From a paper:
Copper-containing nitrite reductases (CuNIRs) catalyze transformation of nitrite to nitric oxide, which has impacts on geochemical, agricultural, and medical health fields. CuNIRs typically have an ∼110 kDa homotrimeric structure, like a Reuleaux triangle. Each protomer contains one type 1 copper (T1Cu) and one type 2 copper (T2Cu) site. The Cys residue forms a peptide-bond bridge (Cys-His bridge) together with one of the His ligands at the T2Cu site to transfer the electron to the catalytic T2Cu site, which is coordinated by three His residues and an axial water molecule.
We bypassed the problem that NO2- decomposes during RT neutron data collection by using formic acid, a stable analog of NO2- and an inhibitor of NO2- reduction. RT ND and XRD data up to 1.90 and 1.20 Å resolution, respectively, were collected from a single crystal of C135A GtNIR in complex with deuterated formic acid and we determined the structure. The electron density shows that formate binds to the T2Cu atom, although it has low occupancy (0.54). The D atom on the central C atom of formate cannot be visualized in the neutron-scattering length density map although the omit map implies its presence, indicating that the formate ligand is unstable and its position at the T2Cu site fluctuates. Formate assumes a κ1-O mode, which is observed in a previously reported cryogenic structure. This finding suggests that differences of data collection temperature do not affect the binding mode of indecomposable ligands. Therefore, the difference of the NO2- binding manners is probably caused by X-ray photoreduction that is greatly facilitated at higher temperatures. OH- is present on one of the two axial sites of the T2Cu in the resting and NO2--bound states, but is partially replaced by a water molecule in the formate-bound structure. This finding means that the ligand at this position can easily absorb and desorb H+ at RT and interconvert between OH- and H2O.
Author numbering:
A (entry chain A), B (entry chain A), C (entry chain A): 15 to 315
Amino acid sequence: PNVIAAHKGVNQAPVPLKMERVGPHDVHIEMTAQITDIEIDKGKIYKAWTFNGQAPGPLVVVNEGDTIHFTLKNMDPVVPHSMDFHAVHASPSKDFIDVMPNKSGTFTYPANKPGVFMYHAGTKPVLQHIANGMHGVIIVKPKNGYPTDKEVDREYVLIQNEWYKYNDMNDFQNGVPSYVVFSSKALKPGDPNTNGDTFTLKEKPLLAKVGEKIRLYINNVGPNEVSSFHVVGTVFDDVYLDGNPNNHLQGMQTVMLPASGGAVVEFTVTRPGTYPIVTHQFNHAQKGAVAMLKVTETGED
Amino acid sequence: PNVIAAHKGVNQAPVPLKMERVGPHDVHIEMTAQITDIEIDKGKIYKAWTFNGQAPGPLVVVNEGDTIHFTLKNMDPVVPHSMDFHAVHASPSKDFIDVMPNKSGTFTYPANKPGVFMYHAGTKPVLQHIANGMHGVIIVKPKNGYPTDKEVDREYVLIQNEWYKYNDMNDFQNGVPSYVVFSSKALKPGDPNTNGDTFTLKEKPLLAKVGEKIRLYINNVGPNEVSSFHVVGTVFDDVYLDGNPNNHLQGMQTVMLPASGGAVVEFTVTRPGTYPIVTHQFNHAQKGAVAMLKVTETGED
Amino acid sequence: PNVIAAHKGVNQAPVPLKMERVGPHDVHIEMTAQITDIEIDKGKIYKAWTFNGQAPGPLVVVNEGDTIHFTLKNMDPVVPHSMDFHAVHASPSKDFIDVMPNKSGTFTYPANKPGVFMYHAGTKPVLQHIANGMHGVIIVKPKNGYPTDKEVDREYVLIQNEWYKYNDMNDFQNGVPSYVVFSSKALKPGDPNTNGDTFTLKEKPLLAKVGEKIRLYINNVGPNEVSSFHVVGTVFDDVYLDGNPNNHLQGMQTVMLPASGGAVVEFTVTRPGTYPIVTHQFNHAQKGAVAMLKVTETGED
Ligand SMILES: [Cu+2]
Ligand SMILES: [Cu+2]
Ligand SMILES: [Cu+2]
Ligand SMILES: [Cu+2]
Ligand SMILES: [Cu+2]
Ligand SMILES: [Cu+2]
Ligand SMILES: [Cu+2]
Ligand SMILES: [Cu+2]
Ligand SMILES: [Cu+2]
């Protein structure tokens, strides 16, 4: 359950995601694997294993049908890391392979399917890499959109994850989570971009305006728990399981998400006030998994 | 993990739900918050935090499009309580607010969406209020019914909940349930109306007649567990997730319910006998979550 | 948590499933209940309570609309056993009854609904019988097939189950699983047929050829956990919940399965390599629930 000697005193500053389109259906993405201290609860630092110094990692957004030319630069001084995108068709033993310390690797694979996909490290033991922070979301936008696109006023991305005792494989396998948390990742400049902690989305709530229809792209990265996702004070008008437009449910109070499962959910906020966003497995909500949406008459705070 | 000193010796007798329609699309509902001893297992009393002296609370049935004018009278001598209906569009910070001891509050909000919705207290810590008994179901009947209405012979309502060590926030967050239980709530005069205990629906089974198609309205209120709902000896002909007629599945053996999730399920019983109703997460079934349906040639016992 | 004295030194050799069609819509099936040592992890023997000396038990495949004439021969010297098929309409108290040691019983019931159904012992306490190994799958093939039948190149059956401390009712109710495992059952001669262990499907992977569309029939028998089923390196093109052709989802990364829940999932493998098959609840994957699919240019190893 200990800290790797070579990580003592290592705290690598966050590095921005690099992404550029190189053709109509081809995108370059470069990420790092790095060791970064994150305050997951007030007064509690976790020396996380991260992509780009965030946990969950940075949001990646591509279009349906894009081929991704992905480079991972491993800045960890001792532990290999790798990348597995749930969005892609790839050979795990050729394309999701380990990149050694202070090396890079480049892999190419297509994102054929629209949706809200988990990404994570694929290095054995996978549980250890996920639990220590190596998870995130890639959104693949559908070529023809969603049937409800014209009704949506505002969009945000939320992610649920757990935290355990530091680097403790016994706890990761057999224990209950110490914290369960939400984070938000920016779809556009100015949106909140946060890490998985117990407090930021309570103290700095997401904003909306009375009468708006909100869309959330959500994924429960786990590693271990399922999620019962609910927004207090509203009902989901439309739900698309895994973000695929064909998996269309209506009028849900709560959306069941497996570990790694995603959804697009849409709902209307009819009155001003503060709306909690929870997992309705309330032991997890009590351990941190409550975010806030503040709805005002103007949409500003 | 203790008993509040002011609740020592308090056992407030159940009070009937009060509901009256005041217009074609407007309904008044008055409930209490009260402290009531419930026998959750033989020889085991839980001094529950309840609505109206039942846990889960009384069934509320309204029509799609009704506006609810809801009054809560708090009879607890020391703890504030509140009401959150998953059925409604409301401002949580204005409409789901605490009512102080020996006060009342009135709130108004619409139920726009059909289905089988959880209700519960919204007072912090929400986990504590739910785990101590402040949960229940509100059914919103669809304006145009369900496509299978003409095939259904009999209807019942079941609810699943957990019980933990008394008022023990550590156990509520980190422990396994001590009991997991079903209760049934009356849709019409004469139907069974019970509390969440390990024994009543085994000793006094629900009744049906050979060849009938039964509909169950079900909700898993939690607080913490998901449910794998199954009726032994049959297969669900039709399932409507959250009770919304558009979320229509067929031929399911078992229905996955998130915490707070609901469904309408319909099935046929072809032969006389006793049919267990379970969560198929069998550790929970062993801890109380088995109800019985007795099917006879006449439908009487 | 002990071994029954009468099972000390008992290790009954596996007996083949007996099945013969006796009419266009009538099938005879004969199974045993027997006590058989299974190596569930390297160096760890579990003296399992089984059907036919396998755990999970043998695969049963029938056609939609078949009536099953089922015989159970109980070879256990002291414990009664029984059979509950989720596929059938039956009276649990008449048709799923106990067969005493060294007796047989015969029961008749129809399989009206297509899908991938759990079977298990129905003897009280059911949790004890399931946890000790008395579970399996019955597939009911749809009369008109699946809409995607013409696209499928290869089929396999996988089952997920847990193992606990030996015959320990406290652990079964309150503990975390010691192991979570996959097994594969043969649809046709030559397919792998294995027991639920931590290693066989890693050391002897399932085979496929580059470019194939694979169909898996899957069921999570539990007893206690839900499953977040995922194949690394691909996305499910089509999913049929519980194997019913009408419950059709597309483009899922991960399929949520309740305890006893099934699915038919189909996906394409585009590149050669080894593809892990997991539950994405990664504590369970770490405890054994990883199988391998080896994809080669020829489909041979
Ligand atoms: Cu390139
Ligand atoms: Cu890593
Ligand atoms: Cu994954
Ligand atoms: Cu009024
Ligand atoms: Cu309360
Ligand atoms: Cu709620
Ligand atoms: Cu016969
Ligand atoms: Cu048995
Ligand atoms: Cu069963």
